[PDB]
Structure 1
Amino acid sequence: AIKKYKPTTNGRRNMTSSDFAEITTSTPEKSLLQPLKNNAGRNNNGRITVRHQGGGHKRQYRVIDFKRNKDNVAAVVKTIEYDPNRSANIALVHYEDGVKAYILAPKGLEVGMRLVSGPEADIKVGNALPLENIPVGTVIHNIEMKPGKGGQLIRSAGTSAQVLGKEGKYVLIRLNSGEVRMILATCRATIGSVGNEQHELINIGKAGRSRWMRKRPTVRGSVMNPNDHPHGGGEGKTPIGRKAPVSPWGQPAIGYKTRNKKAKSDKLIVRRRT
């Protein structure tokens, strides 16, 4: 659940966090840890390409098994662990053959569940099946767009998609955004919804906490200089003073769509949203 801190200090005032009740341990799997460096929004040229990123706490990457292509044997859920890299929690699972892996933790997952993957797996939270085998109306997550590539869609905490129907070699899906689109029927998905639904409700509370989470301050364009931002300049506070608000590089910032107009995936997107 969400615990609210008493307003002992102005910084702590109105702050909330998770109790981490679901988390069963704090010792990740050594075999599955990998090193990660904080790119801080800088590409191979060393230029800042994405603003407002950098600093914050050190992290280790946990190798998640998005593919769920090990259908031979059952995987027993050993622990539910905190993952610094993603909003959702992960689950360490042991395959009966001794292979250890991490998966996303679906809502309602519990230690001891014996998950299975493959066409014949039953429709139970945490199981993985090709979309063709998942009955309509089912709630799923960790959907892959191409067979064997591994789950890409519906992975954030609390997210979920629903199977609407079949057609041809494609399966009709409503994604978490409300967009309805076709996805290749041989793509896999995990039954259920991503756990840690409460994540959205956390109140960060103070600037230092965002800095921990690797967000650097965001400076409004209206308080820059004209050579810095189209909104920059002007005496005193100023209105936008343009036809429409724009990003630092002149791209309109309200309502202007950016999806490529000749996207190949229009043929598969049935109903858009966002």
Structure 2
Amino acid sequence: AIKKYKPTTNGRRNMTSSDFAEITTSTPEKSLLQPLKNNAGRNNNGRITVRHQGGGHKRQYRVIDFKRNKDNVAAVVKTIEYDPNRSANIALVHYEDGVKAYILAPKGLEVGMRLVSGPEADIKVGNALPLENIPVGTVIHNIEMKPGKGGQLIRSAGTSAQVLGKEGKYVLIRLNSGEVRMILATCRATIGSVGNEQHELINIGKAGRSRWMRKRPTVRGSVMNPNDHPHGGGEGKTPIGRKAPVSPWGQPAIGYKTRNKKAKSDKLIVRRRT
């Protein structure tokens, strides 16, 4: 659940966090841990390509099995663990043959659940099936766009998608964004919705916490200089003072669509949203 801190200090005032009750252990699997360096939004050229990133707490990557392609044996859910790299929690599961792995934690997952993958798997939380075998109306997550590539859609905390129907070699899916689109029927997905549904309600509370979470301060364009931002310059506070608000590189900010107009996927996108 969400625990709200008493206003002992102005920094602590109005702050809330997660009690991490669902978390069972704080010992990550050494075998599945991999090193990660903080790129701080800088590419191989060393240029800052994405602003407002850098600093923060060191993290280790937990290899998540988004593919869920080990259909032979079931996996016993051993622990629900905190993952610094993603909003949702992860789950350490042991395969009966002795292979240990991580998966995204679906809502309602419990330690001891015996999860299965493959066309014959039952329609239960945590199981993985090809979309063709998932009955209409089912709630799913961890949907893979290309067969064998591994789940890509619906992976953030609390997200979910709904199966709406079949057509040809495609399955109709409503994604968390509300966009309705076709996805190749041979693609797999996990039954249920991503756990940690409460993540959105957390009130960060202070700047230092964002810094911990690796967000550097964001500067409004209206307070920069003319050569720095289109909104920069002017005496005192000023309005946008342009036909439309624009990004630092002149791209309009409000309402201007950026999706490629000749994108191939348009053929598969049935109804858009956002």
TM-score of the superposed pair, with normalisation by structure 1: 1.00
Alpha-carbon separation, structure 1, partners of 2:210 and 2:241: 31
TM-superposed deviation, 1:88: 0.1
Equivalent position SS for 1:31: coil
Deviations 1:27-75 (A, max 9, x none): 0000000000000000000000000000000000000000000000000
Alpha-carbon separation, structure 2, partners of 1:157 and 1:91: 13
Alpha-carbon separation, structure 1, partners of 2:196 and 2:150: 21
TM-superposed deviation, 1:268: 0.1
Equivalent position SS for 2:94: strand
Alpha-carbon separation, structure 2, partners of 1:2 and 1:70: 35
Alpha-carbon separation, structure 1, partners of 2:256 and 2:269: 20
Q: Percent identity?
A: 100
TM-superposed deviation, 1:261: 0.1
TM-superposed deviation, 1:273: 0.2
Alpha-carbon separation, structure 1, partners of 2:179 and 2:80: 30
What is the aligned partner in structure 1 of residue 82 from structure 2? 82
Deviations 1:47-106 (A, max 9, x none): 000000000000000000000000000000000000000000000000000000000000
TM-superposed deviation, 1:204: 0.1
Alpha-carbon separation, structure 1, partners of 2:158 and 2:108: 11
Alpha-carbon separation, structure 1, partners of 2:145 and 2:219: 36
User: What runs of 5+ residues in structure 1 fail to find an aligned partner?
Assistant: none
Alpha-carbon separation, structure 2, partners of 1:265 and 1:219: 35
TM-superposed deviation, 1:137: 0.2
TM-superposed deviation, 1:146: 0.2
What is the aligned partner in structure 2 of residue 36 from structure 1? 36
TM-superposed deviation, 1:267: 0.2
Alpha-carbon separation, structure 2, partners of 1:93 and 1:146: 25
TM-superposed deviation, 1:132: 0.1
Deviations 1:162-187 (A, max 9, x none): 00000000000000000000000000
TM-superposed deviation, 1:141: 0.1
What is the aligned partner in structure 1 of residue 189 from structure 2? 189
What is the aligned partner in structure 1 of residue 141 from structure 2? 141
TM-superposed deviation, 1:124: 0.2
Alpha-carbon separation, structure 1, partners of 2:148 and 2:57: 33
TM-superposed deviation, 1:231: 0.1
What is the aligned partner in structure 1 of residue 21 from structure 2? 21
TM-superposed deviation, 1:227: 0.2
Equivalent position SS for 2:31: helix
Alpha-carbon separation, structure 2, partners of 1:257 and 1:94: 45
Alpha-carbon separation, structure 2, partners of 1:93 and 1:201: 28
User: What runs of 5+ residues in structure 2 fail to find an aligned partner?
Assistant: none
Number of residues paired by the alignment?
274
Alpha-carbon separation, structure 1, partners of 2:272 and 2:162: 15
Alpha-carbon separation, structure 2, partners of 1:111 and 1:175: 28
TM-superposed deviation, 1:214: 0.1
- After the TM superposition, which parts of structure 1 deviate over 3 Å for at least 4 consecutive aligned residues? none
Q: CA RMSD in A?
A: 0.2
Alpha-carbon separation, structure 2, partners of 1:95 and 1:167: 35
Equivalent position SS for 2:11: coil
Alpha-carbon separation, structure 1, partners of 2:225 and 2:201: 36
Deviations 1:224-252 (A, max 9, x none): 00000000000000000000000000000
TM-superposed deviation, 1:190: 0.2
Deviations 1:146-167 (A, max 9, x none): 0000000000000000000000
